[PDB]
Amino acid sequence: GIVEQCCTSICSLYQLENYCN
Amino acid sequence: FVNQHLCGSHLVEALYLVCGERGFFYTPKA
């Protein structure tokens, strides 16, 4: 999930946008 | 502000700034 991709590991704009509506 | 470890309120803040008027969904348990 998002915590695994952005918190535990380094985040990226590509991944963050996957969570926008 | 996006390319680092973002947790808790710090992650929520990033989603807020990036998504803008589109909004977003935050799911810690996924």
CSV table of N, CA and C in Angstrom, one decimal:
chain,number,residue,atom,x,y,z
A,1,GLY,N,0.8,-1.2,0.0
A,1,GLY,CA,0.0,0.0,0.0
A,1,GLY,C,0.8,1.3,0.0
A,2,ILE,N,0.2,2.4,0.2
A,2,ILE,CA,0.9,3.7,0.2
A,2,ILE,C,1.9,3.8,1.3
A,3,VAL,N,1.7,3.2,2.4
A,3,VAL,CA,2.7,3.3,3.5
A,3,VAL,C,4.0,2.6,3.2
A,4,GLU,N,3.8,1.4,2.5
A,4,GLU,CA,4.9,0.6,2.1
A,4,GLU,C,5.7,1.4,1.0
A,5,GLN,N,5.0,2.0,0.1
A,5,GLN,CA,5.7,2.7,-1.0
A,5,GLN,C,6.2,4.1,-0.7
A,6,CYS,N,5.6,4.8,0.3
A,6,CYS,CA,6.0,6.2,0.6
A,6,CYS,C,6.6,6.5,2.0
A,7,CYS,N,6.2,5.6,2.9
A,7,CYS,CA,6.7,5.8,4.3
A,7,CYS,C,7.9,4.9,4.6
A,8,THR,N,7.7,3.6,4.5
A,8,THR,CA,8.8,2.7,4.7
A,8,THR,C,9.9,2.8,3.6
A,9,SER,N,9.5,3.1,2.4
A,9,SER,CA,10.5,3.3,1.4
A,9,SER,C,10.3,4.7,0.8
A,10,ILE,N,11.2,5.2,-0.1
A,10,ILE,CA,11.1,6.5,-0.6
A,10,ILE,C,9.9,6.7,-1.6
A,11,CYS,N,9.1,7.8,-1.4
A,11,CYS,CA,8.0,8.1,-2.2
A,11,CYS,C,8.4,8.7,-3.5
A,12,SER,N,7.4,8.9,-4.4
A,12,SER,CA,7.6,9.5,-5.7
A,12,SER,C,6.3,10.1,-6.1
A,13,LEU,N,6.4,11.1,-7.0
A,13,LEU,CA,5.2,11.8,-7.5
A,13,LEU,C,4.3,10.8,-8.3
A,14,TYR,N,4.9,9.9,-9.0
A,14,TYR,CA,4.2,8.9,-9.8
A,14,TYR,C,3.3,8.1,-8.9
A,15,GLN,N,3.8,7.6,-7.8
A,15,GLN,CA,3.1,6.8,-6.8
A,15,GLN,C,2.0,7.6,-6.1
A,16,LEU,N,2.3,8.8,-5.6
A,16,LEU,CA,1.4,9.7,-4.9
A,16,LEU,C,0.1,9.9,-5.8
A,17,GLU,N,0.3,10.2,-7.0
A,17,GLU,CA,-0.8,10.5,-7.9
A,17,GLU,C,-1.7,9.3,-8.1
A,18,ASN,N,-1.3,8.1,-7.8
A,18,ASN,CA,-2.1,6.9,-7.9
A,18,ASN,C,-3.2,7.0,-6.8
A,19,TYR,N,-3.0,7.8,-5.8
A,19,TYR,CA,-4.0,8.0,-4.8
A,19,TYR,C,-4.9,9.2,-4.9
A,20,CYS,N,-4.8,10.0,-5.9
A,20,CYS,CA,-5.6,11.1,-6.1
A,20,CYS,C,-6.9,10.6,-6.7
A,21,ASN,N,-8.0,11.3,-6.5
A,21,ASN,CA,-9.3,10.8,-7.0
A,21,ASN,C,-9.5,11.1,-8.5
B,1,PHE,N,9.5,18.1,-1.9
B,1,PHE,CA,8.8,17.6,-0.7
B,1,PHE,C,8.2,16.2,-0.9
B,2,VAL,N,8.3,15.7,-2.2
B,2,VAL,CA,7.7,14.4,-2.5
B,2,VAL,C,8.7,13.2,-2.5
B,3,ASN,N,9.9,13.5,-2.8
B,3,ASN,CA,10.9,12.4,-2.9
B,3,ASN,C,11.7,12.1,-1.6
B,4,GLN,N,11.0,11.6,-0.6
B,4,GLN,CA,11.6,11.3,0.7
B,4,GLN,C,10.6,10.3,1.4
B,5,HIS,N,10.9,9.9,2.6
B,5,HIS,CA,10.1,9.1,3.4
B,5,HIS,C,9.0,10.0,4.0
B,6,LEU,N,7.7,9.7,3.7
B,6,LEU,CA,6.6,10.5,4.1
B,6,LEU,C,5.7,9.6,4.9
B,7,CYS,N,5.5,9.9,6.2
B,7,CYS,CA,4.7,9.1,7.1
B,7,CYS,C,3.7,9.9,7.9
B,8,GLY,N,2.6,9.3,8.2
B,8,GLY,CA,1.6,10.0,9.0
B,8,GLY,C,1.1,11.3,8.4
B,9,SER,N,1.1,12.4,9.2
B,9,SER,CA,0.6,13.7,8.8
B,9,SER,C,1.4,14.2,7.6
B,10,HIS,N,2.7,13.8,7.6
B,10,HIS,CA,3.6,14.3,6.5
B,10,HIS,C,3.2,13.7,5.2
B,11,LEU,N,2.7,12.5,5.1
B,11,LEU,CA,2.2,11.8,3.9
B,11,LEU,C,0.9,12.4,3.5
B,12,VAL,N,0.0,12.6,4.5
B,12,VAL,CA,-1.3,13.2,4.2
B,12,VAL,C,-1.2,14.6,3.7
B,13,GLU,N,-0.2,15.4,4.2
B,13,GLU,CA,0.0,16.7,3.7
B,13,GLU,C,0.5,16.7,2.2
B,14,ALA,N,1.4,15.8,1.8
B,14,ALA,CA,1.9,15.6,0.5
B,14,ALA,C,0.7,15.3,-0.5
B,15,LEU,N,-0.2,14.4,-0.1
B,15,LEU,CA,-1.3,14.0,-0.9
B,15,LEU,C,-2.2,15.2,-1.1
B,16,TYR,N,-2.4,16.0,-0.1
B,16,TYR,CA,-3.2,17.2,-0.1
B,16,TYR,C,-2.7,18.2,-1.2
B,17,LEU,N,-1.4,18.5,-1.1
B,17,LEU,CA,-0.7,19.4,-2.0
B,17,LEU,C,-0.7,18.9,-3.5
B,18,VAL,N,-0.4,17.6,-3.6
B,18,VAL,CA,-0.3,17.1,-5.0
B,18,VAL,C,-1.6,16.9,-5.7
B,19,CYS,N,-2.6,16.3,-5.0
B,19,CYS,CA,-3.9,16.0,-5.6
B,19,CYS,C,-4.8,17.3,-5.8
B,20,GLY,N,-4.6,18.3,-5.0
B,20,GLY,CA,-5.4,19.5,-5.1
B,20,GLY,C,-6.9,19.3,-5.0
B,21,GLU,N,-7.6,19.9,-5.9
B,21,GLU,CA,-9.1,19.9,-6.0
B,21,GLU,C,-9.7,18.5,-6.4
B,22,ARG,N,-8.8,17.6,-6.8
B,22,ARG,CA,-9.2,16.3,-7.2
B,22,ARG,C,-9.5,15.5,-5.9
B,23,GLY,N,-8.7,15.8,-4.8
B,23,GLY,CA,-8.9,15.1,-3.6
B,23,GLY,C,-8.1,13.8,-3.6
B,24,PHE,N,-8.2,13.0,-2.6
B,24,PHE,CA,-7.5,11.8,-2.5
B,24,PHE,C,-8.0,10.8,-1.5
B,25,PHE,N,-7.5,9.6,-1.4
B,25,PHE,CA,-7.9,8.6,-0.4
B,25,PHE,C,-6.7,8.2,0.3
B,26,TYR,N,-6.8,8.1,1.6
B,26,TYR,CA,-5.6,7.6,2.4
B,26,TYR,C,-6.0,6.3,3.1
B,27,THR,N,-5.3,5.2,2.8
B,27,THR,CA,-5.6,3.9,3.3
B,27,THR,C,-4.3,3.3,3.9
B,28,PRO,N,-4.1,3.5,5.2
B,28,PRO,CA,-2.9,2.9,5.9
B,28,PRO,C,-2.8,1.4,5.8
B,29,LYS,N,-4.0,0.8,6.0
B,29,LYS,CA,-4.1,-0.7,5.9
B,29,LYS,C,-4.6,-1.1,4.6
B,30,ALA,N,-3.7,-1.4,3.7
B,30,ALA,CA,-4.0,-1.8,2.3
B,30,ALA,C,-3.0,-2.8,1.8
